[PDB]
Design a protein around this ligand. Sequence first.
Ligand SMILES: Nc1ncnc2c1ncn2[C@@H]1O[C@H](COP(=O)(O)OP(=O)(O)O)[C@@H](O)[C@H]1O
Ligand SMILES: [Ca+2]
Lengths: 68, 116, 375
Amino acid sequence: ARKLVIIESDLERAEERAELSEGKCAELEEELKTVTNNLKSLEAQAEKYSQKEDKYEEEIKVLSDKLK
Amino acid sequence: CFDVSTIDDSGEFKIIVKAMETLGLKESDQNSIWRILAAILHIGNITFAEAAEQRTGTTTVKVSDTKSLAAAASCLKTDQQSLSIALCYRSISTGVGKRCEVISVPMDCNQAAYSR
Amino acid sequence: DEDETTALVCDNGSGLVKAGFAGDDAPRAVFPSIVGRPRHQGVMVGMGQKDSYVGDEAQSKRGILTLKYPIEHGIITNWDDMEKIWHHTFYNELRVAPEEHPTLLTEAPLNPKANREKMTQIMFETFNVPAMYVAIQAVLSLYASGRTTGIVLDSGDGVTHNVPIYEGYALPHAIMRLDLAGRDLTDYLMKILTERGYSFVTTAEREIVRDIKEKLCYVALDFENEMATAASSSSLEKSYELPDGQVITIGNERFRCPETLFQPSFIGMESAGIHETTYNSIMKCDIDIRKDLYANNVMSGGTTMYPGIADRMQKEITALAPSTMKIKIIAPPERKYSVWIGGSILASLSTFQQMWITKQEYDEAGPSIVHRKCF
Ligand SMILES: Nc1ncnc2c1ncn2[C@@H]1O[C@H](COP(=O)(O)OP(=O)(O)O)[C@@H](O)[C@H]1O
Ligand SMILES: [Ca+2]
């Protein structure tokens, strides 16, 4: 009867840490998808900013020549 | 200069093969070694051009002839870009544990051709 | 190692103790120059506390420690505690005996005369050093970056120094010293933090202020235009989960404190900004020697790592400076270790022999040997 309590109590500990872990893991998994999307989005913008400032580099150069 | 009248090119190759085979370097092994040498040739043929990254007169290094630097990473089969992030740019951290590579320094031309 | 014999490189400041083995390009074991005791009386029995808690062991556990810093920019509050800082350097991390390999330390420009003789007493008489020199902070970095003709402004947490070294050191003054860096920014935060229900009270957690600072805090390009932007809660506040557990939405807090750098009027000092003092040093030199100084400006130190540090200089300088030639500032993307890279240089030079102090040289010219040969 006592041994039953020991194992039954472990079941409560196991069930508790299981639902808690899965609950946060699911929340984390969903969050990663949002962060990953933000990464892809920001990376895309950075690419547009990089190619733009580079276009100004060749633009400011040719203008400097015409000015000279 | 490449073609020379004195020395015969096609005639020597077959003699080199004999020398390798006579010692202990079969064609199977030869090919396995040529890949290593051919890899270096790809990482060799890359004298990067002027990189208009700076503002005034100085400059850094950047690839214009990509297919050449791509060949260097081709045999390596790695992200062509990431490769140049750690080489042309010098990364250093260290302290406590031991180093963490990512943040780096676009070095000048002299140190650029130096590492090259 | 069947190469040479007796060689090493070192460098200390108000942040990290940069040091390594013989003939190295980069440091090997950097650690915070801290040291404290126990405000908690360390389980007195779970060891006779002692060892103030210096080194990684100290930085690991801050709570028990009452981090009382010894060398605040120039002044050494106490030398007795310095004894067991170098006892941790050469013996624990470096794993080499100081009674063999030379040592290359750094010199805080214009350091009290009485200090030099005191230091030498700790090395020669106690740690027995038959060869060592204490080079002057800035000049070292000059030869590393590959510059012979530029103006250096090397400073991190210690003291600000405007060293116009492009063709000669030790000559007219044209140099300045300002106790406004690092720890000044580390202590000022807790003050203004009070208005946001935050207060890093004691010194132990004060050290963390610096940790978070160097990962987000940036400098405002123009405070006026960014004042109205405050309404737009997007570029300001950013969720920073404190390791323990207490979010801090730093936003306007990021570009408010750094403003003190260019405006020392926020802490009761008439000291002019780092771009005014620059003029003060340039106006002393000849008239036909400025056009080349503006061409290249050596901005080094960990203080020159924050966002918006170089671009701001090119805005304020051009105003009260000649406007004809081109002006470019050389700020090595990693300009903190500029001193160490330069340290590696002088560490491998043989001409350096006509600089350091030999064991016998000290006894032949008394304690004044330092200021009798060096300068
Ligand atoms: N990338 C960085 N960004 C911001 N701060 C940095 C960076 N790298 C180093 N630091 C800081 O710079 C300081 C060390 O700079 P340093 O010039 O060596 O100082 P000192 O010479 O006064 O000892 C430390 O506070 C460190 O945290
Ligand atoms: Ca210093």
